[PDB]
Protein backbone atom coordinates (compact mmCIF):
# COMPACT_ATOMS: atom_id res chain seq x y z
CA UNK A 1 0.00 0.00 0.00
CA UNK A 2 0.84 3.70 -0.26
CA UNK A 3 0.66 5.91 2.87
CA UNK A 4 1.41 9.23 1.15
CA UNK A 5 -1.45 11.76 0.93
CA UNK A 6 -2.62 13.35 -2.31
CA UNK A 7 0.40 15.20 -3.71
CA UNK A 8 -0.07 18.40 -5.69
CA UNK A 9 3.29 18.10 -7.49
CA UNK A 10 2.90 14.50 -8.73
CA UNK A 11 0.73 11.41 -8.48
CA UNK A 12 0.89 10.17 -4.88
CA UNK A 13 1.00 6.59 -6.17
CA UNK A 14 3.66 7.40 -8.78
CA UNK A 15 6.04 8.98 -6.25
CA UNK A 16 5.60 5.99 -3.93
CA UNK A 17 6.03 3.39 -6.68
CA UNK A 18 9.22 5.14 -7.82
CA UNK A 19 10.60 5.01 -4.27
CA UNK A 20 9.64 1.32 -4.13
CA UNK A 21 10.95 0.48 -7.61
CA UNK A 22 14.43 1.83 -6.90
CA UNK A 23 14.63 -0.38 -3.80
CA UNK A 24 14.86 -3.28 -6.27
CA UNK A 25 17.71 -1.50 -8.07
CA UNK A 26 19.81 -1.41 -4.88
CA UNK A 27 20.59 -4.97 -3.75
CA UNK A 28 21.79 -5.99 -0.30
CA UNK A 29 23.12 -9.36 0.86
CA UNK A 30 23.13 -10.10 4.59
CA UNK A 31 25.95 -12.63 4.01
CA UNK A 32 28.34 -10.67 1.79
CA UNK A 33 31.10 -11.32 4.35
CA UNK A 34 31.19 -14.94 3.16
CA UNK A 35 32.91 -13.47 0.09
CA UNK A 36 35.59 -12.17 2.51
CA UNK A 37 36.47 -15.20 4.68
CA UNK A 38 39.19 -13.24 6.52
CA UNK A 39 36.61 -10.81 7.97
CA UNK A 40 34.18 -11.28 10.85
CA UNK A 41 30.76 -9.64 11.33
CA UNK A 42 31.95 -7.79 14.46
CA UNK A 43 34.52 -5.81 12.46
CA UNK A 44 31.69 -4.22 10.47
CA UNK A 45 30.05 -3.01 13.69
CA UNK A 46 33.32 -1.51 14.96
CA UNK A 47 33.79 0.38 11.68
CA UNK A 48 30.22 1.68 11.44
CA UNK A 49 30.32 2.72 15.10
CA UNK A 50 33.54 4.62 14.39
CA UNK A 51 31.95 6.40 11.42
CA UNK A 52 29.08 7.45 13.70
CA UNK A 53 31.46 9.14 16.13
CA UNK A 54 33.25 10.81 13.21
CA UNK A 55 29.92 12.19 12.00
CA UNK A 56 29.07 13.70 15.39
CA UNK A 57 32.47 15.41 15.72
CA UNK A 58 32.03 17.20 12.39
CA UNK A 59 28.25 17.47 12.94
CA UNK A 60 27.41 15.44 9.84
CA UNK A 61 23.81 14.50 9.13
CA UNK A 62 22.34 11.08 9.87
CA UNK A 63 21.68 10.72 6.13
CA UNK A 64 25.42 11.09 5.53
CA UNK A 65 26.28 8.18 7.84
CA UNK A 66 23.65 5.85 6.37
CA UNK A 67 24.84 6.73 2.86
CA UNK A 68 28.33 5.64 3.91
CA UNK A 69 26.89 2.47 5.44
CA UNK A 70 25.02 1.60 2.24
CA UNK A 71 28.05 2.39 0.07
CA UNK A 72 30.19 0.18 2.32
CA UNK A 73 27.84 -2.82 2.30
CA UNK A 74 27.15 -2.68 -1.45
CA UNK A 75 30.81 -2.19 -2.38
CA UNK A 76 31.79 -5.22 -0.30
CA UNK A 77 29.19 -7.34 -2.11
CA UNK A 78 31.14 -6.65 -5.33
CA UNK A 79 34.60 -7.38 -3.88
CA UNK A 80 36.32 -10.54 -2.64
CA UNK A 81 38.93 -11.04 0.11
CA UNK A 82 39.62 -7.89 2.17
CA UNK A 83 42.07 -7.45 5.05
CA UNK A 84 41.30 -5.64 8.32
CA UNK A 85 43.65 -2.72 7.65
CA UNK A 86 41.78 -1.97 4.40
CA UNK A 87 38.45 -1.58 6.22
CA UNK A 88 39.28 1.86 7.62
CA UNK A 89 40.14 3.22 4.16
CA UNK A 90 36.93 1.89 2.58
CA UNK A 91 34.84 3.24 5.44
CA UNK A 92 36.30 6.74 5.58
CA UNK A 93 36.17 7.02 1.77
CA UNK A 94 32.52 5.95 1.72
CA UNK A 95 31.89 8.71 4.25
CA UNK A 96 33.90 11.12 2.09
CA UNK A 97 31.67 10.39 -0.91
CA UNK A 98 28.59 10.64 1.30
CA UNK A 99 29.61 13.95 2.88
CA UNK A 100 30.24 15.55 -0.52
CA UNK A 101 26.79 14.38 -1.68
CA UNK A 102 24.69 15.47 1.31
CA UNK A 103 26.41 18.32 3.18
CA UNK A 104 26.24 21.91 1.97
CA UNK A 105 29.75 22.70 3.28
CA UNK A 106 31.39 19.28 3.69
CA UNK A 107 34.72 18.79 5.48
CA UNK A 108 37.89 18.95 3.42
CA UNK A 109 39.83 15.91 2.24
CA UNK A 110 42.69 16.22 4.74
CA UNK A 111 40.21 16.25 7.64
CA UNK A 112 38.95 12.84 6.52
CA UNK A 113 42.58 11.72 6.45
CA UNK A 114 43.15 13.45 9.81
CA UNK A 115 40.63 11.37 11.78
CA UNK A 116 42.29 8.14 10.58
CA UNK A 117 45.32 8.94 12.81
CA UNK A 118 47.58 8.81 9.77
CA UNK A 119 46.49 5.33 8.67
CA UNK A 120 44.94 6.86 5.52
CA UNK A 121 46.45 9.60 3.37
CA UNK A 122 44.57 12.08 1.22
CA UNK A 123 45.67 10.34 -1.98
CA UNK A 124 44.62 6.96 -0.59
CA UNK A 125 41.11 8.32 0.01
CA UNK A 126 40.86 9.77 -3.51
CA UNK A 127 41.99 6.44 -4.97
CA UNK A 128 39.46 4.59 -2.81
CA UNK A 129 36.52 6.90 -3.57
CA UNK A 130 36.97 6.28 -7.31
CA UNK A 131 37.14 2.51 -6.85
CA UNK A 132 33.99 2.60 -4.70
CA UNK A 133 31.97 4.72 -7.12
CA UNK A 134 33.10 2.73 -10.17
CA UNK A 135 32.35 -0.63 -8.53
CA UNK A 136 28.88 0.60 -7.50
CA UNK A 137 28.20 1.61 -11.14
CA UNK A 138 27.83 5.18 -9.79
CA UNK A 139 24.56 4.14 -8.11
CA UNK A 140 24.99 6.58 -5.23
CA UNK A 141 21.37 7.69 -4.62
CA UNK A 142 19.78 5.04 -2.38
CA UNK A 143 16.93 5.35 0.12
CA UNK A 144 18.72 5.02 3.44
CA UNK A 145 17.29 3.54 6.63
CA UNK A 146 17.05 7.00 8.17
CA UNK A 147 15.37 8.51 5.09
CA UNK A 148 12.43 6.11 5.50
CA UNK A 149 12.08 7.17 9.14
CA UNK A 150 11.83 10.80 7.99
CA UNK A 151 8.96 9.83 5.67
CA UNK A 152 7.21 7.82 8.38
CA UNK A 153 7.49 10.68 10.88
CA UNK A 154 6.01 13.27 8.52
CA UNK A 155 3.02 11.06 7.67
CA UNK A 156 2.44 10.29 11.35
CA UNK A 157 2.09 14.04 12.04
CA UNK A 158 0.23 14.98 8.86
CA UNK A 159 -2.36 17.67 9.49
CA UNK A 160 -5.76 17.70 7.81
CA UNK A 161 -4.12 20.09 5.32
CA UNK A 162 -1.92 17.58 3.50
CA UNK A 163 1.51 19.19 2.99
CA UNK A 164 4.14 16.44 3.05
CA UNK A 165 7.20 18.45 1.96
CA UNK A 166 7.40 20.88 4.90
CA UNK A 167 8.76 19.04 7.97
CA UNK A 168 6.68 18.90 11.14
CA UNK A 169 7.18 16.20 13.79
CA UNK A 170 8.67 15.99 17.31
CA UNK A 171 12.45 15.90 17.24
CA UNK A 172 12.57 14.14 20.63
CA UNK A 173 10.80 10.97 19.48
CA UNK A 174 12.59 10.99 16.11
CA UNK A 175 16.05 10.64 17.67
CA UNK A 176 14.76 7.87 19.95
CA UNK A 177 13.69 5.72 17.00
CA UNK A 178 16.95 6.58 15.23
CA UNK A 179 18.80 5.31 18.31
CA UNK A 180 17.21 1.88 17.84
CA UNK A 181 18.07 1.89 14.13
CA UNK A 182 21.67 2.95 14.82
CA UNK A 183 22.03 -0.18 16.96
CA UNK A 184 20.35 -2.58 14.52
CA UNK A 185 22.52 -1.36 11.63
CA UNK A 186 25.63 -2.57 13.48
CA UNK A 187 24.36 -6.15 13.08
CA UNK A 188 24.95 -7.43 9.55
CA UNK A 189 21.79 -9.57 9.59
CA UNK A 190 19.66 -6.42 9.16
CA UNK A 191 20.33 -6.50 5.40
CA UNK A 192 17.99 -9.50 5.19
CA UNK A 193 15.14 -6.99 5.58
CA UNK A 194 14.67 -3.99 3.27
CA UNK A 195 15.54 -0.55 4.60
CA UNK A 196 11.88 0.49 4.56
CA UNK A 197 10.99 -2.57 6.64
CA UNK A 198 13.70 -1.89 9.23
CA UNK A 199 12.57 1.72 9.75
CA UNK A 200 8.91 0.71 10.01
CA UNK A 201 9.79 -2.04 12.49
CA UNK A 202 11.70 0.41 14.70
CA UNK A 203 8.76 2.82 14.56
CA UNK A 204 6.43 0.00 15.62
CA UNK A 205 8.42 -0.69 18.79
CA UNK A 206 7.91 2.96 19.83
CA UNK A 207 4.27 3.17 18.69
CA UNK A 208 1.85 0.52 17.42
CA UNK A 209 0.99 -1.58 14.39
CA UNK A 210 -1.88 0.77 13.51
CA UNK A 211 0.37 3.84 13.48
CA UNK A 212 3.06 1.90 11.59
CA UNK A 213 0.61 0.79 8.90
CA UNK A 214 -0.91 4.26 8.42
CA UNK A 215 2.48 5.88 7.77
CA UNK A 216 4.41 3.00 6.13
CA UNK A 217 1.68 1.18 4.19
CA UNK A 218 3.16 -2.21 5.12
CA UNK A 219 0.95 -4.88 6.64
CA UNK A 220 1.83 -6.48 9.97
CA UNK A 221 2.75 -9.73 8.20
CA UNK A 222 5.43 -7.89 6.19
CA UNK A 223 7.31 -6.59 9.25
CA UNK A 224 6.55 -9.42 11.70
CA UNK A 225 9.74 -11.23 10.71
CA UNK A 226 11.75 -8.02 11.10
CA UNK A 227 9.97 -7.06 14.34
CA UNK A 228 10.73 -10.48 15.83
CA UNK A 229 14.36 -10.07 14.76
CA UNK A 230 14.47 -6.51 16.14
CA UNK A 231 13.05 -7.84 19.44
CA UNK A 232 16.39 -8.07 21.34
CA UNK A 233 17.64 -4.70 20.08
CA UNK A 234 14.39 -2.98 21.09
CA UNK A 235 14.55 -4.06 24.74
CA UNK A 236 18.20 -3.09 25.23
CA UNK A 237 17.15 0.45 24.31
CA UNK A 238 14.17 0.24 26.67
CA UNK A 239 16.27 -1.09 29.56
CA UNK A 240 18.69 1.86 29.44
CA UNK A 241 16.06 4.46 28.51
CA UNK A 242 15.53 6.99 25.74
CA UNK A 243 18.11 9.60 24.78
CA UNK A 244 17.67 13.37 24.93
CA UNK A 245 17.75 15.75 21.97
CA UNK A 246 21.18 17.36 21.88
CA UNK A 247 21.96 20.92 20.81
CA UNK A 248 24.88 21.42 18.41
CA UNK A 249 26.58 24.82 18.26
CA UNK A 250 26.27 26.29 14.78
CA UNK A 251 23.29 24.05 13.94
CA UNK A 252 19.79 25.51 14.04
CA UNK A 253 17.44 23.93 16.57
CA UNK A 254 14.92 23.10 13.82
CA UNK A 255 17.62 20.86 12.29
CA UNK A 256 19.13 19.55 15.54
CA UNK A 257 17.51 16.12 15.22
CA UNK A 258 19.10 15.44 11.81
CA UNK A 259 22.64 15.51 13.26
CA UNK A 260 24.23 12.10 13.77
CA UNK A 261 25.03 11.22 17.39
CA UNK A 262 27.12 8.47 18.94
CA UNK A 263 26.70 6.40 22.09
CA UNK A 264 29.16 3.71 23.16
CA UNK A 265 26.73 0.91 22.19
CA UNK A 266 28.77 -2.15 21.02
CA UNK A 267 28.11 -3.81 24.38
CA UNK A 268 24.42 -3.25 23.62
CA UNK A 269 24.79 -5.15 20.35
CA UNK A 270 26.22 -8.05 22.38
CA UNK A 271 23.31 -8.09 24.83
CA UNK A 272 20.95 -8.52 21.87
CA UNK A 273 22.82 -11.63 20.69
CA UNK A 274 21.84 -13.41 23.92
Amino acid sequence: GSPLPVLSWANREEVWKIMLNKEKTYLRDQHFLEQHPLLQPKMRAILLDWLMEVCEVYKLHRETFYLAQDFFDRYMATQENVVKTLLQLIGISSLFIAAKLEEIYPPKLHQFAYVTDGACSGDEILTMELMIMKALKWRLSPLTIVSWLNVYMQVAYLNDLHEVLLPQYPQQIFIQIAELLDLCVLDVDCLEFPYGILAASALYHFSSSELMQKVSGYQWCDIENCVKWMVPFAMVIRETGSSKLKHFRGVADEDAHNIQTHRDSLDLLDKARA
Binding site: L4, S8, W9, A10, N11, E14, V15, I18, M19, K22, T25, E63, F96, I97, K100, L101, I104, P106, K108, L109, I125, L126, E129, L130, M133, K134, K137, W138, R139, L140, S141, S147, N150, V151, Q154, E163, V164, L165, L166, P167, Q168, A252, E254, D255, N258
Partner: protein, 298 residues
Protein backbone atom coordinates in the same frame (compact mmCIF):
# COMPACT_ATOMS: atom_id res chain seq x y z
CA UNK B 1 38.58 6.54 -24.95
CA UNK B 2 40.01 5.41 -28.29
CA UNK B 3 37.00 5.43 -30.64
CA UNK B 4 36.21 9.09 -29.83
CA UNK B 5 37.72 11.99 -31.77
CA UNK B 6 37.18 15.56 -30.61
CA UNK B 7 35.60 17.80 -33.26
CA UNK B 8 35.02 21.14 -31.53
CA UNK B 9 34.92 22.63 -28.04
CA UNK B 10 31.31 23.35 -27.08
CA UNK B 11 32.29 25.50 -24.11
CA UNK B 12 33.91 25.86 -20.69
CA UNK B 13 31.87 27.07 -17.72
CA UNK B 14 30.70 26.01 -14.29
CA UNK B 15 29.76 22.66 -15.85
CA UNK B 16 33.36 22.00 -16.90
CA UNK B 17 35.01 21.50 -20.29
CA UNK B 18 32.56 20.14 -22.88
CA UNK B 19 33.78 18.94 -26.29
CA UNK B 20 31.86 17.69 -29.30
CA UNK B 21 33.25 14.26 -30.16
CA UNK B 22 32.56 11.86 -33.03
CA UNK B 23 32.81 8.07 -32.96
CA UNK B 24 34.99 7.01 -35.87
CA UNK B 25 33.53 3.52 -36.37
CA UNK B 26 29.82 4.17 -35.78
CA UNK B 27 29.55 7.82 -36.81
CA UNK B 28 27.92 8.70 -33.48
CA UNK B 29 28.46 12.21 -32.13
CA UNK B 30 28.44 12.80 -28.37
CA UNK B 31 29.06 15.65 -25.96
CA UNK B 32 32.15 14.87 -23.88
CA UNK B 33 32.57 16.58 -20.50
CA UNK B 34 36.22 16.48 -19.39
CA UNK B 35 37.15 16.58 -15.70
CA UNK B 36 40.84 16.89 -14.80
CA UNK B 37 41.27 15.05 -11.50
CA UNK B 38 44.87 16.18 -10.94
CA UNK B 39 43.56 19.74 -10.50
CA UNK B 40 40.83 18.77 -8.00
CA UNK B 41 42.19 18.63 -4.45
CA UNK B 42 38.92 17.18 -3.12
CA UNK B 43 38.76 14.37 -5.68
CA UNK B 44 35.70 14.10 -7.90
CA UNK B 45 33.73 17.37 -7.48
CA UNK B 46 30.51 17.17 -5.50
CA UNK B 47 28.63 18.62 -8.48
CA UNK B 48 29.96 15.78 -10.66
CA UNK B 49 29.10 13.01 -8.18
CA UNK B 50 25.58 14.42 -7.82
CA UNK B 51 25.00 14.90 -11.55
CA UNK B 52 26.25 11.41 -12.48
CA UNK B 53 24.19 9.58 -9.85
CA UNK B 54 21.05 11.63 -10.55
CA UNK B 55 21.26 11.20 -14.33
CA UNK B 56 21.85 7.44 -14.15
CA UNK B 57 18.35 7.22 -12.62
CA UNK B 58 16.65 9.96 -14.68
CA UNK B 59 16.20 8.27 -18.07
CA UNK B 60 13.58 10.32 -19.92
CA UNK B 61 13.17 11.48 -23.54
CA UNK B 62 13.21 15.14 -22.43
CA UNK B 63 16.37 14.83 -20.29
CA UNK B 64 19.83 14.82 -21.88
CA UNK B 65 21.10 11.28 -21.36
CA UNK B 66 24.33 10.38 -19.59
CA UNK B 67 25.73 7.58 -21.75
CA UNK B 68 28.94 6.56 -19.96
CA UNK B 69 31.40 7.55 -17.23
CA UNK B 70 35.00 6.73 -18.17
CA UNK B 71 37.98 7.08 -15.82
CA UNK B 72 41.15 6.79 -17.92
CA UNK B 73 44.27 8.69 -16.76
CA UNK B 74 43.72 11.08 -13.84
CA UNK B 75 40.73 12.33 -15.86
CA UNK B 76 37.00 11.66 -15.70
CA UNK B 77 35.10 11.69 -19.00
CA UNK B 78 31.30 12.04 -18.95
CA UNK B 79 29.73 10.96 -22.24
CA UNK B 80 26.43 12.74 -22.92
CA UNK B 81 23.95 12.66 -25.76
CA UNK B 82 24.57 15.44 -28.29
CA UNK B 83 22.12 18.20 -29.24
CA UNK B 84 23.17 20.84 -31.74
CA UNK B 85 21.78 24.02 -30.18
CA UNK B 86 20.61 25.55 -26.91
CA UNK B 87 17.32 27.39 -26.57
CA UNK B 88 18.96 30.78 -25.96
CA UNK B 89 20.73 30.70 -29.33
CA UNK B 90 17.47 29.59 -30.97
CA UNK B 91 15.45 32.42 -29.40
CA UNK B 92 18.09 34.95 -30.47
CA UNK B 93 18.08 33.59 -34.02
CA UNK B 94 14.26 33.80 -33.92
CA UNK B 95 14.12 37.24 -32.28
CA UNK B 96 13.14 39.12 -35.44
CA UNK B 97 10.67 36.58 -36.86
CA UNK B 98 9.43 35.22 -33.52
CA UNK B 99 9.15 31.56 -32.55
CA UNK B 100 5.92 30.06 -33.98
CA UNK B 101 3.23 29.63 -31.35
CA UNK B 102 2.72 25.88 -32.08
CA UNK B 103 6.46 25.39 -31.49
CA UNK B 104 6.38 27.39 -28.25
CA UNK B 105 3.47 25.25 -27.06
CA UNK B 106 5.32 22.08 -28.08
CA UNK B 107 8.56 23.13 -26.38
CA UNK B 108 6.86 24.15 -23.13
CA UNK B 109 4.83 20.92 -23.12
CA UNK B 110 7.99 18.82 -23.44
CA UNK B 111 9.79 20.87 -20.79
CA UNK B 112 6.90 20.33 -18.37
CA UNK B 113 7.04 16.59 -19.10
CA UNK B 114 10.74 16.33 -18.33
CA UNK B 115 10.25 18.50 -15.25
CA UNK B 116 7.30 16.43 -14.02
CA UNK B 117 9.52 13.36 -14.40
CA UNK B 118 12.26 15.04 -12.34
CA UNK B 119 9.84 16.04 -9.59
CA UNK B 120 8.13 12.63 -9.43
CA UNK B 121 11.64 11.23 -8.89
CA UNK B 122 12.13 13.86 -6.14
CA UNK B 123 14.77 15.84 -8.04
CA UNK B 124 14.99 19.63 -8.21
CA UNK B 125 16.85 21.06 -11.20
CA UNK B 126 17.43 24.53 -9.66
CA UNK B 127 19.07 26.01 -12.78
CA UNK B 128 16.43 26.14 -15.53
CA UNK B 129 17.64 28.79 -17.97
CA UNK B 130 17.56 28.89 -21.79
CA UNK B 131 21.29 28.05 -21.88
CA UNK B 132 20.49 24.74 -20.15
CA UNK B 133 17.66 23.80 -22.55
CA UNK B 134 18.90 21.93 -25.61
CA UNK B 135 17.05 21.26 -28.87
CA UNK B 136 17.70 18.95 -31.80
CA UNK B 137 16.69 18.96 -35.47
CA UNK B 138 13.67 16.71 -34.79
CA UNK B 139 11.55 19.15 -32.76
CA UNK B 140 12.62 17.94 -29.31
CA UNK B 141 13.87 19.99 -26.34
CA UNK B 142 15.66 18.52 -23.33
CA UNK B 143 16.79 19.49 -19.84
CA UNK B 144 20.56 19.61 -19.38
CA UNK B 145 23.22 20.54 -16.81
CA UNK B 146 22.14 18.77 -13.61
CA UNK B 147 25.25 19.93 -11.72
CA UNK B 148 23.17 22.26 -9.55
CA UNK B 149 20.40 19.68 -9.10
CA UNK B 150 19.58 18.01 -5.80
CA UNK B 151 17.32 15.17 -4.73
CA UNK B 152 14.90 16.31 -2.04
CA UNK B 153 13.54 14.17 0.76
CA UNK B 154 9.96 13.77 1.94
CA UNK B 155 9.80 16.01 3.89
CA UNK B 156 12.55 18.36 2.67
CA UNK B 157 15.04 20.17 4.90
CA UNK B 158 16.91 23.46 4.55
CA UNK B 159 18.92 23.24 1.32
CA UNK B 160 21.53 25.47 -0.35
CA UNK B 161 20.55 29.15 -0.41
CA UNK B 162 20.69 31.54 -3.39
CA UNK B 163 20.23 28.91 -6.11
CA UNK B 164 19.10 29.44 -9.74
CA UNK B 165 20.46 32.11 -12.07
CA UNK B 166 19.23 35.55 -11.04
CA UNK B 167 16.88 36.25 -13.97
CA UNK B 168 15.01 32.97 -13.39
CA UNK B 169 15.12 32.91 -9.57
CA UNK B 170 11.81 32.53 -7.75
CA UNK B 171 10.70 35.30 -5.36
CA UNK B 172 10.69 32.96 -2.35
CA UNK B 173 14.42 32.41 -2.88
CA UNK B 174 15.05 36.16 -3.19
CA UNK B 175 13.15 36.70 0.08
CA UNK B 176 15.21 34.06 1.91
CA UNK B 177 12.83 31.16 2.51
CA UNK B 178 14.10 28.40 4.80
CA UNK B 179 12.67 25.47 2.82
CA UNK B 180 11.93 25.16 -0.89
CA UNK B 181 11.10 22.42 -3.36
CA UNK B 182 9.55 21.94 -6.80
CA UNK B 183 7.99 25.41 -7.09
CA UNK B 184 11.33 27.06 -7.92
CA UNK B 185 11.61 25.15 -11.21
CA UNK B 186 8.07 26.09 -12.27
CA UNK B 187 8.87 29.78 -11.77
CA UNK B 188 11.96 29.45 -13.97
CA UNK B 189 9.88 27.72 -16.64
CA UNK B 190 7.26 30.47 -16.46
CA UNK B 191 9.99 33.04 -17.07
CA UNK B 192 11.26 30.94 -19.99
CA UNK B 193 7.68 30.64 -21.29
CA UNK B 194 7.18 34.42 -21.38
CA UNK B 195 10.68 34.87 -22.81
CA UNK B 196 9.80 32.64 -25.78
CA UNK B 197 6.65 34.72 -26.35
CA UNK B 198 8.18 38.19 -26.04
CA UNK B 199 11.70 37.28 -27.29
CA UNK B 200 13.03 39.15 -24.25
CA UNK B 201 13.82 38.19 -20.66
CA UNK B 202 10.81 38.68 -18.39
CA UNK B 203 12.74 39.91 -15.32
CA UNK B 204 16.28 40.91 -16.39
CA UNK B 205 17.56 42.04 -13.01
CA UNK B 206 21.12 43.00 -12.12
CA UNK B 207 20.98 42.57 -8.32
CA UNK B 208 18.88 40.61 -5.85
CA UNK B 209 16.84 43.67 -4.86
CA UNK B 210 16.53 44.82 -8.49
CA UNK B 211 15.40 41.34 -9.52
CA UNK B 212 12.76 41.42 -6.78
CA UNK B 213 11.54 44.90 -7.71
CA UNK B 214 11.28 43.90 -11.37
CA UNK B 215 9.04 41.03 -10.27
CA UNK B 216 7.02 43.40 -8.08
CA UNK B 217 6.68 45.90 -10.94
CA UNK B 218 5.00 43.28 -13.15
CA UNK B 219 3.07 41.01 -10.76
CA UNK B 220 2.40 43.61 -8.05
CA UNK B 221 3.94 43.90 -4.60
CA UNK B 222 2.63 40.80 -2.77
CA UNK B 223 0.89 40.93 0.59
CA UNK B 224 -0.44 38.44 3.15
CA UNK B 225 -3.61 37.83 1.12
CA UNK B 226 -1.95 36.80 -2.14
CA UNK B 227 0.96 35.15 -0.29
CA UNK B 228 0.43 34.13 3.34
CA UNK B 229 3.59 34.68 5.37
CA UNK B 230 5.40 36.97 2.92
CA UNK B 231 5.62 39.78 5.49
CA UNK B 232 7.45 37.43 7.90
CA UNK B 233 10.16 36.35 5.45
CA UNK B 234 13.75 37.31 6.38
CA UNK B 235 14.42 39.55 3.38
CA UNK B 236 10.97 41.19 3.35
CA UNK B 237 10.94 44.90 4.11
CA UNK B 238 7.82 46.98 4.87
CA UNK B 239 9.52 49.77 2.88
CA UNK B 240 9.05 47.85 -0.39
CA UNK B 241 7.26 50.11 -2.91
CA UNK B 242 3.67 49.25 -3.79
CA UNK B 243 3.30 48.46 -7.50
CA UNK B 244 0.06 47.35 -9.13
CA UNK B 245 -0.13 44.10 -11.07
CA UNK B 246 0.08 44.72 -14.80
CA UNK B 247 -2.50 43.29 -17.18
CA UNK B 248 -1.07 40.19 -18.84
CA UNK B 249 -2.38 41.58 -22.15
CA UNK B 250 0.59 43.97 -21.90
CA UNK B 251 3.11 41.55 -20.35
CA UNK B 252 2.58 38.84 -22.99
CA UNK B 253 0.60 40.49 -25.82
CA UNK B 254 0.78 37.58 -28.31
CA UNK B 255 -0.51 35.08 -25.73
CA UNK B 256 -4.17 34.04 -25.84
CA UNK B 257 -6.38 33.62 -22.78
CA UNK B 258 -5.36 29.98 -22.30
CA UNK B 259 -1.69 30.96 -22.37
CA UNK B 260 -2.12 33.89 -19.99
CA UNK B 261 -3.93 31.61 -17.53
CA UNK B 262 -1.14 29.02 -17.53
CA UNK B 263 1.55 31.70 -17.25
CA UNK B 264 -0.22 33.32 -14.29
CA UNK B 265 -0.40 29.99 -12.44
CA UNK B 266 3.30 29.34 -13.11
CA UNK B 267 4.12 32.82 -11.75
CA UNK B 268 1.98 32.66 -8.60
CA UNK B 269 3.76 34.28 -5.66
CA UNK B 270 2.70 31.60 -3.17
CA UNK B 271 4.86 28.49 -3.78
CA UNK B 272 2.10 26.33 -2.28
CA UNK B 273 -0.40 27.68 -4.83
CA UNK B 274 1.98 27.76 -7.80
CA UNK B 275 0.86 25.23 -10.40
CA UNK B 276 2.74 21.94 -10.53
CA UNK B 277 4.42 20.51 -13.61
CA UNK B 278 1.94 17.63 -13.82
CA UNK B 279 -1.06 19.94 -13.38
CA UNK B 280 0.32 22.31 -16.02
CA UNK B 281 0.28 19.41 -18.50
CA UNK B 282 -3.48 19.15 -17.91
CA UNK B 283 -4.06 22.87 -18.53
CA UNK B 284 -6.40 23.70 -21.47
CA UNK B 285 -3.43 25.40 -23.12
CA UNK B 286 -2.33 21.92 -24.26
CA UNK B 287 -5.81 20.44 -24.83
CA UNK B 288 -5.05 20.32 -28.57
CA UNK B 289 -1.63 18.72 -28.05
CA UNK B 290 -2.65 15.96 -25.62
CA UNK B 291 -5.69 13.89 -24.67
CA UNK B 292 -6.26 12.85 -21.04
CA UNK B 293 -5.90 9.25 -19.92
CA UNK B 294 -8.81 7.48 -18.16
CA UNK B 295 -8.35 7.88 -14.41
CA UNK B 296 -8.98 4.84 -12.21
CA UNK B 297 -11.15 6.21 -9.39
CA UNK B 298 -10.27 3.53 -6.86
Amino acid sequence: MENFQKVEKIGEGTYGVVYKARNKLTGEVVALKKIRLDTETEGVPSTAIREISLLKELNHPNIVKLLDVIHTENKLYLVFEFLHQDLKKFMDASALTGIPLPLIKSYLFQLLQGLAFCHSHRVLHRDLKPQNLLINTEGAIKLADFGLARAFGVPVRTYTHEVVTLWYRAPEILLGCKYYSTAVDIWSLGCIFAEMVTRRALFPGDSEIDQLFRIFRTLGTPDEVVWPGVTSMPDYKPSFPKWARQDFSKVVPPLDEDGRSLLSQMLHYDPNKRISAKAALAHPFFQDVTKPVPHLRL
